[PDB]
Amino acid sequence: AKELRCQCIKTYSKPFHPKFIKELRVIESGPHCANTEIIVKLSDGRELCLDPKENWVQRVVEKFLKRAENS
Amino acid sequence: AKELRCQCIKTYSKPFHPKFIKELRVIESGPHCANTEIIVKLSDGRELCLDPKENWVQRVVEKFLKRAENS
């Protein structure tokens, strides 16, 4: 219990399409973060962090849910 | 490329409250699963699988998003 950083320190400043998203990850404020961070994983086997502060993020992410649900 | 099982083979048949949920995980149909599975992680450091086929799942999960977003 000394110093803990959020799971996401930076974000992605480039809107994309869920076509590259295969796995979604959302972590609520934890003992390391006092806020909320929406993480994601690309099929290429990579992991990035999005900022819910951007409208395009709420969209590309919304589509992923509507796509994984309709599947 | 021989045999791959879905990330979630079983599900939870007991509705609960997002109060125990700290991290959410959603994996769309992959090379191992031809469908969609909503995984989740409890603060206790455990991981289970929910079935979007249940209405209470769409609710406790919906609250998590509305809670992590309002935070």
For chain B, what is the HEC assignment? CCCCCCCCCCCCCCCCCHHHEEEEEEECCCCCCCCCEEEEEECCCEEEEECCCCHHHHHHHHHHHHHHHHC
B45: how many CB neighbours lie within 10 A of its CB? 7
B25: β partners? A25, B39
Closest CA to A65 of B47, B52, B15: B52
Instruction: Look up the CATH number of domain B1-71.
Output: 2.40.50.40
* Experimental determination approach used: NMR
Q: For residues B25 and B12, what is the distance between their CA atoms, to the nearest angstrom?
A: 15
Q: Tokens representing A44?
A: 């290429």
Q: For residues A23 and A45, what is the distance between their CA atoms, to the nearest angstrom?
A: 10
Q: Does B13 touch chain A (CB under 8 A)?
A: no
Q: For residues A36 and A28, what is the distance between their CA atoms, to the nearest angstrom?
A: 5
Residue B37, amino acid: E
- CA distances B45 to A46, A62, B2, Å, are 23, 27, 32
C-alpha angle with apex B43: B38 to B48, nearest 5 degrees?
30
Taking CA atoms, what residue in B is nearest to A24?
A: B26
> What part of B 40-69 touches A (C-beta under 8 Å)?
52, 64-65, 67-69
Contacts of A69 (CB under 8 A, 6+ apart): B36, B52
User: Is the dihedral angle over the CA atoms B22, A58, A21, A32 positive or is it negative?
Assistant: negative
Closest CA to A41 of A4, A70, A7: A7
Q: Tokens representing B43?
A: 């603060």
Closest CA to B26 of B16, B41, B12: B41
Contacts of B23 (CB under 8 A, 6+ apart): A25, A26, A27, A28, A30, B40, B41
The residue assigned the tokens 């509507």 is: A66
Q: Does B22 touch chain A (CB under 8 A)?
A: yes
- CA distances A10 to A3, A5, A6, A37, A41, Å, are 18, 11, 10, 10, 15
Per-residue burial over A28-44, b if 16 or more Cβ lie within 10 Å, else e, is bebeebeebbbbbbeee
Q: Tokens representing B38?
A: 């909503």
